[PDB]
Each structure stands twice: as structure tokens, then as C-alpha cells.
Amino acid sequence: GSLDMNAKRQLYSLIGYASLRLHYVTVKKPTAVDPNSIVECRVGDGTVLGTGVGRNIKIAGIRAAENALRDKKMLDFYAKQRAAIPRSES
């Protein structure tokens, strides 16, 4: 499908923020019945910015991080947020 090389990396660069505490959640994984995995890039806000699927939690995570990363508006949203943060300790 539409998989990249450095999604979790690029994303982390794009949105990735100590305040956004973005992460990858595994909804599904490779199994005998279905050797596929699902992932959703959530954030400290408990909201899911991205969602990708792949053979494993990586390809999914990759696809997701990237997937969410593909979206600029959100990118510029989270970033703009970082700067638009009311209270920041880090």
C-alpha cells in the first residue's frame, strides 16, 4: 500500500511534541486467521491524529504516523498548539 520509510520519525518531527505525547496504539496484530495489524496514532489529548495498518504494529504504526503526518492542517494544528500552549513545564 502507501507505506513510507520514516513515518514515526517524520511525524514526530512534524507533530511529535513532548506536550502532545503522541503514541501508537495496537488495535490488531498478525494472527493465524489474519496476519495483519492495526494502529492509531493517539495524543496526550486522548484523541487519535493518525491511523495506519500493516503486516505488524510497525508497518501499521508507520502508515499511521505518516498517515496522520500527511495531514498538514493537523500538523500545523498540533505545532501551532505547542506554541499555543497555555501551560508548559517541558
UniProtKB/Swiss-Prot annotation:
Top-rank lineage group of the source organism: Eukaryota
Coiled-coil ranges per UniProt: none
Domain DRBM: 6-74
Further remark: Present with 4970 molecules/cell in log phase SD medium.
Physiological role: DsRNA-specific nuclease that cleaves eukaryotic pre-ribosomal RNA at the U3 snoRNP-dependent A0 site in the 5'-external transcribed spacer (ETS) and in the 3'-ETS. In vitro, cleaves synthetic 5'-ETS RNA A0 site in the absence of snoRNA or other factors. Has an essential growth function in addition to pre-rRNA processing.
Name of protein: Ribonuclease 3
Organism classification: Eukaryota, Fungi, Dikarya, Ascomycota, Saccharomycotina
Gene: RNT1
Complete-protein stretch covered: 366 to 453 of 471
